[PDB]
Amino acid sequence: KVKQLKAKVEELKSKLWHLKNKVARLKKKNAECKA
Amino acid sequence: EVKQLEAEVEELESEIWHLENEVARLEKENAECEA
Question: Do the chains contact at B34 and A12, CB–CB below 8 Å?
Fold first, then answer.
């Protein structure tokens, strides 16, 4: 119910935040690799 | 309430899909530069 959706939102928020940090890490790795 | 949460879930999933696409691309670029 409204409870389940709430759980999906929190899971998606957590996954989104993980992805933003991953993308920022990969951008810096690539910039450095390109020396 | 459900109409609002249902909408936030769609917004979160779309941002995720784009980041996942960006991650895959960045991992590829990193693969080449590292090789």
Answer: no
Judged by CB atoms closer than 8 Å, whether chains meet at B12 and A19 is answered as no
A3 touches chain B (CB under 8 A): no
Method of determination? Answer: X-ray
Long-range CB contacts for residues A6-9, cutoff 8 Å, separation at least 24: A6/B5, A8/B9, A9/B5, A9/B8, A9/B9, A9/B12
Substitution target from A1, A3, A4, A9 for chain B, most B beta carbons within 10 A: A9
Range of the domain at A34: 1-35
Please give the Cα distance from B20 to A31 (Å, whole number): 19
Q: What does this entry list as its resolution, in Å?
A: 2.1
